[PDB]
């Protein structure tokens, strides 16, 4: 697969996974701006996309991130569609693509150019959805690692009482409860602050989850 | 170059009596340039940091004369002024070590007052401009920044208020932005009152009469009136100046020169 | 409004010298704090009121400074600021007007962001792949949160969304009380009438009122600042 699609319609969570592996090694770095198309000056950004992605072709290993690609999923949109034609004629272009890689991220899978949603170019797609009682438990068990806890351990009320979220909101809320545990400056961390603080702060993230 | 030692203005010159009708504004700017000199310790006893400076801008009028005023009235130690002509020069970047060495001379001259004229030379960048961005951002870091001191005198004189960055960066340190308010119908008689120490003036001359028939005749043009008075007094071999003698020079220098301007 | 100065003093002081507890309870130092909201609160003046409480190495840095004429200055300033920040001890540096350069627009009528947001995304690379980032903190503040990058939702990135709910005049008499507790003022200050008179004013405008009170105090006859010179300054400049 030479392309992936990451749409977390509830909240987010793709940026900490792409940030997990990419922050781990990523083997390289290359970033494409979501607003790299407005082009106040003359509309000659095509040669600079050929230059940038030509440098990506110059590097044998390469991973390219395109975060928030729903902004260009709509002469305002004319040059946007010109950069989209650069995407078409540079992914399906003429180059040895046996080693390059790229990852495209978005927010909502509704305005993602169903003409671009044609398979072949976007080979991979992973929908991050409501709690399946497995992924939230796994991500909770791996986020509970670096944080310290007491002997009393509970997870059913944390997976059950936190809905509509992912590992990103669970990371910010669990680490928020940990910051309440450092606001209690004790030598242990009982999960009472996790139940009440993850409950209330998670409800605040449900209020401001827009 | 030799401008670094030319920054000193010895040989006192025009005194307080060239105020062009700004009887209140001369206090609204004297309060920072000359008031903190009589009793500097009492401002420290007040608790507040001594004032920084004011902003003079707008029309030219009789500009650059108030610096001579600040030279004559300051009878202790003349100050340093920095005209904007030394900023716009070939091989930019000299103004950094230049402002650091005139600040060094300011610390060597027991807190010498520093003046900055003609900000419109590099003002209004509206971002070849990066070399100007260095001189103006470093200029803000040396003037608006408290690096030398929040102290005695900072001021910018100009003919255009279009300065983008200094207008939004002055209120933190600087204050008291006032217009120039060039003299009209009530200041030219006082510029004649300071020109009373020129060539002998007959008591028949009425300063208001010579100062009311000359619209748009600030200190420069009436300074040329008092110059052509003695000049034609030499061309006519006159011993005393009288307005009825050089009235042709007056209405000539204002009318014959106001036809095309 | 003391929870936004106390929450900030905590959020910038505790990640400085609590490494012992950071290794006793496994807590990471807070990095991202969003001091957004309407003007008047003086995010730069209050960030100076907290930076003075820290007194660390402060370096100037604004939002639209990335907008230049030539190429190569953005990486020089980002990698220079994180070169001295990455080299020296952990300090405190406050920036402002982050939304002026981190704003995306569907309409392509007029916007830059090519190298401003490509260099800004190089800065977000230095905050994206650099886990040893426990060094010098970069406090960010915006003037409006209408448009915001959805990728900025993280504990290391902007999380402490501090809003300004039109602070009361008493809060302006608290930050103005800190900005006026140094002068030799006669100890008759209720702060209530002079707080109530300072309506719809900014922080630098209140400091201009205090300076204006410090101007005529020489010619008022008394060497100690009085109570009526504050309202005299209010009616004087504004």
Q: What is the DSSP string of C172-234?
A: HHHHHHHTTSSS-B-S---SSHHHHH--S--HHHHHHHHHHHTTTTTTTS-SSB-SHHHHHHH
Q: Smallest CA–CA separation between A40 and chain C, in Å?
A: 6
- How many Cβ atoms from other residues are within 10 Å of residue A93's Cβ? 13
A74–C125 CB contact, under 8 Å: no
Angle between helices B164-173 and B130-143 (to 10 degrees): 20
**With touching defined as 3+ CB pairs under 8 A, do chains B and A touch?**
no
Residue B31 with chain C: CB contacts under 8 Å = 215
User: How wide is the angle at C-alpha C39 spanned by C-alphas C37 and C44, nearest 5°?
Assistant: 95
Cα separation, A193 vs A10, whole angstroms: 25
Measure CB to CB from residue C218 to each of B35, B47, B129 and give the nearest one: B35
A182–C25 CB contact, under 8 Å: yes
C interface residues, B as partner, C-beta within 8 Å: 60, 67-70, 73, 182-185, 204-205, 208, 210-212, 214-215, 217-218, 223-225
Find the residue in A nearest to C120 (Cα).
A33
Q: Are B26 and B19 in contact (CB under 8 A)?
A: yes
Residue B35 with chain C: CB contacts under 8 Å = 218
C73–B141 CB contact, under 8 Å: no
Cα separation, A114 vs A121, whole angstroms: 12
Cα separation, C79 vs B256, whole angstroms: 63
Measure CB to CB from residue A148 to each of C26, C118, C130 and give the nearest one: C26
Kindly give the residue spans of alpha helices, DSSP state H, lying in B7-120.
25-33, 35-38, 40-46, 65-72, 94-108
Distance of CA C161 to the CA centre of its chain: 13
C151–A75 CB contact, under 8 Å: no
Cα separation, C203 vs C175, whole angstroms: 8
Residue B47 with chain C: CB contacts under 8 Å = 182-185, 225
Cα separation, A74 vs A97, whole angstroms: 28
Closest CA to C134 of C22, C4, C21, C8: C22
Find the residue in B nearest to C208 (Cα).
B175
C14 phi, psi to nearest 5 deg: -65, -30
A39–C108 CB contact, under 8 Å: yes
Residue A3 annotated as lining a ligand binding site: no
Q: Are A95 and C126 in contact (CB under 8 A)?
A: no
Method: cryo-EM
Residue indicated by tokens 């960030």: C47
Tokens of C83: 């070169």
Residue partners of C4: CB distance under 8 A and separation at least 6: C162, C164
Sign of CA dihedral A183, A187, A190, A192: negative
Q: Are A1 and A124 in contact (CB under 8 A)?
A: yes
Measure CB to CB from residue B45 to each of C69, C70, C184 and give the nearest one: C184
B51–C214 CB contact, under 8 Å: yes
Q: Are B61 and B187 in contact (CB under 8 A)?
A: no
Find the residue in C nearest to A144 (Cα).
C26
Distances (CA, A) of C112 to B106, C103, C105, C232: 43, 10, 10, 46
Ramachandran assignment for B56, one of left (phi > 0), alpha (psi -120 to 50 degrees), beta (any other): beta
Residues C3-41 as b/e (b if ≥16 CB within 10 A, e otherwise) read: ebbeebeebbebbeebeeebeebbbbbbbbbbbbbeebb
Residue partners of A86: CB distance under 8 A and separation at least 6: A46, A49, A50, A53
Cα separation, C79 vs C210, whole angstroms: 39
Q: Where are the beta strands (DSSP E) in chain B?
A: 55-57, 80-82, 114-117, 156-157, 177-179
Residue partners of A10: CB distance under 8 A and separation at least 6: A128, A129, A130, A164, A165, A166, A209
Q: In what order do the strands lie in the sheet with A100-106?
A: A62-66, A100-106, A4-7, A124-127
A40–C154 CB contact, under 8 Å: no
DSSP 8-state code for residue B68: H
C68–B130 CB contact, under 8 Å: yes
CA dihedral C45, C48, C52, C57 (to 10 degrees): -160
C108–A38 CB contact, under 8 Å: yes
Cα separation, C202 vs C39, whole angstroms: 7
Cα separation, C54 vs C150, whole angstroms: 31
Residue C215 with chain B: CB contacts under 8 Å = 31, 51
- How many Cβ atoms from other residues are within 10 Å of residue C192's Cβ? 11
Distances (CA, A) of B85 to B99, B113, B160: 14, 19, 15
Q: Smallest CA–CA separation between B127 and chain C, in Å?
A: 6
Closest CA to B111 of B80, B139, B84, B140: B80
Kindly give the residue spans of alpha helices, DSSP state H, lying in A46-166.
46-58, 78-91, 135-143, 156-161
DSSP 8-state code for residue B253: I
Cα separation, B177 vs B53, whole angstroms: 9
Measure CB to CB from residue B51 to each of C67, C215, C225 and give the nearest one: C215
C2 phi, psi to nearest 5 deg: -105, -10
Residue A148 with chain C: CB contacts under 8 Å = 25-26
Mutant choice from B42, B48, B168 vs C, greatest count of C C-beta within 10 A? B48
Q: Strand, helix or coil at A100?
A: strand
Measure CB to CB from residue B171 to each of C183, C208, C214 and give the nearest one: C208
State the distance between the two ends of chain B, measured CA to CA, in whole angstroms.
Answer: 37
Tokens of B96: 């950094």
Residue C122 with chain A: CB contacts under 8 Å = 31
Cα separation, B21 vs B111, whole angstroms: 31
Residue A147 with chain C: CB contacts under 8 Å = 26
Cα separation, A98 vs A61, whole angstroms: 10
- How many Cβ atoms from other residues are within 10 Å of residue B76's Cβ? 7
**What's the residue count for chain A?**
210
Q: Are C106 and A76 in contact (CB under 8 A)?
A: yes
Find the residue in B nearest to C45 (Cα).
B172
The kind and range of the H/E element at B172 are: helix B164-173
Cα separation, A197 vs A199, whole angstroms: 5
Residue partners of A99: CB distance under 8 A and separation at least 6: A60, A61, A62
Cα separation, B188 vs B165, whole angstroms: 35
Burial class (CB in 10 A: 0-12, 13-18, 19+), C43: buried
Cross-strand bridge partners of residue B82: B116
- Cβ contacts below 8 Å, chain A against chain C, sum to 102
Pairing verdict, β C92-94 and C137-139: parallel
Cα separation, A175 vs C28, whole angstroms: 9
Measure CB to CB from residue C182 to each of B47, B129, B172 and give the nearest one: B47
Measure CB to CB from residue B129 to each of C69, C185, C225 and give the nearest one: C69
DSSP 8-state code for residue A132: -
Pairing verdict, β B114-117 and B80-82: parallel
């Amino acid at each position: 697969p030479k392309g992936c699609l990451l749409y977390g319609p509830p909240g987010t969570g793709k940026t900490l996974l792409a940030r997990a592996v990419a922050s781990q090694l990523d083997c390289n770095f290359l970033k494409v701006v979501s607003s790299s198309i407005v082009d106040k000056y003359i509309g000659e950004s095509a040669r600079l996309i050929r230059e940038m992605f030509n440098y990506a072709r110059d590097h044998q290993p390469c991973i390219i991130f395109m975060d928030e690609i729903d902004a260009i999923g709509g002469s305002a949109d004319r040059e946007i569609q010109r950069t989209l034609m650069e995407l078409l004629n540079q992914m399906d272009g003429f180059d040895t693509l046996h080693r390059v890689k790229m990852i495209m991220a978005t927010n909502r899978p509704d305005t993602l150019d169903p003409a671009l949603l044609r398979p072949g170019r976007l080979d991979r797609k992973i929908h991050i959805d409501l709690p399946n009682e497995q992924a939230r438990l796994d991500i909770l068990k791996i986020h509970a690692g670096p944080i310290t806890k007491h002997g009393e351990i509970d997870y059913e009320a944390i997976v059950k009482l936190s809905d509509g979220f992912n590992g990103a909101d669970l990371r910010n809320v669990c680490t928020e409860a940990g910051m309440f545990a450092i606001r209690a400056d004790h030598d242990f961390v009982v999960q009472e602050d996790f139940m009440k603080a993850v409950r209330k702060v998670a409800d605040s993230k449900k209020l401001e989850s827009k | 170059p030799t401008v670094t030692m030319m920054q000193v203005e010895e040989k006192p010159d025009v005194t307080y009596s060239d105020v062009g009708g700004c009887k209140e504004q001369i206090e609204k700017l004297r309060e920072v340039v000359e008031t903190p000199l009589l009793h500097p310790e009492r401002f420290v006893n007040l608790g507040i940091e001594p004032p920084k400076g004011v902003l003079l801008f707008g029309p030219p009028g009789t500009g650059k004369t108030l610096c001579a005023r600040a030279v004559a009235n300051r009878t202790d130690a003349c100050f340093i002024r920095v005209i904007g002509s030394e900023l716009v020069q070939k091989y930019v970047g000299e103004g950094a070590r230049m402002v650091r060495e005139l600040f060094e001379m300011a610390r060597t001259k027991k807190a010498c007052l520093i003046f900055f004229d003609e900000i419109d030379a590099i003002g209004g960048a509206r971002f070849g401009d990066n070399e100007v961005q260095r001189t103006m951002l470093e200029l803000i870091n040396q003037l608006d920044g408290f690096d030398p001191r929040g102290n005695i005198k900072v001021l910018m004189a100009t003919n255009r208020p279009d300065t983008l960055d200094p207008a939004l960066m002055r209120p933190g340190r600087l204050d008291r932005k006032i217009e120039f308010s060039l003299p009209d119908l009530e200041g030219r008689t006082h510029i004649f009152k300071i020109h009373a120490r020129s060539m002998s003036v007959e008591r028949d001359i009425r300063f208001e009469l010579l100062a009311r028939l000359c619209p748009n005749s600030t200190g420069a043009e009436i300074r040329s009136v008092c110059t052509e008075a003695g000049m034609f007094a030499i061309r006519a071999r006159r011993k005393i100046a009288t307005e009825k003698d050089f009235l042709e020079a007056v209405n000539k220098v204002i009318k014959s020169y106001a036809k095309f301007s | 409004l003391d929870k936004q100065i106390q929450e900030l003093v905590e959020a910038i002081v505790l990640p400085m010298n609590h490494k012992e507890k950071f290794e006793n309870l496994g807590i990471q130092p807070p990095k991202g704090v969003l001091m957004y909201g309407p003007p008047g609160t003086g995010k730069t003046l209050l960030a100076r009121a907290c930076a003075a409480q820290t007194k660390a190495t402060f370096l100037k840095l604004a939002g639209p400074q990335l907008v230049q004429m030539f190429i190569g200055d953005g990486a020089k300033l980002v990698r220079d600021a994180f070169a001295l920040a990455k080299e020296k001890a952990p300090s405190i540096i406050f920036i402002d007007e982050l939304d002026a350069i981190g704003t995306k627009r569907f309409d392509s009528e007029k916007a830059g962001d090519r190298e401003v947001q490509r260099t800004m995304l190089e800065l977000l690379n230095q905050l994206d792949g650099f886990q040893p980032n426990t060094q010098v903190k970069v406090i960010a503040a915006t003037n409006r949160v209408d448009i915001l990058d959805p990728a900025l939702l993280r504990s290391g990135r902007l999380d402490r969304k501090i809003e300004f709910p039109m602070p009361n005049e008493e809060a302006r008499a608290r930050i103005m009380q800190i900005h006026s507790r140094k002068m030799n003022v006669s100890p008759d200050v209720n702060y209530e009438e002079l707080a109530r008179c300072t309506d719809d004013f900014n922080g630098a405008q209140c400091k201009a009122v205090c300076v204006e009170a410090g101007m005529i105090a020489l010619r008022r006859g008394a060497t100690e600042l009085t109570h009526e010179d504050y309202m005299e300054g209010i009616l004087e400049v504004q």
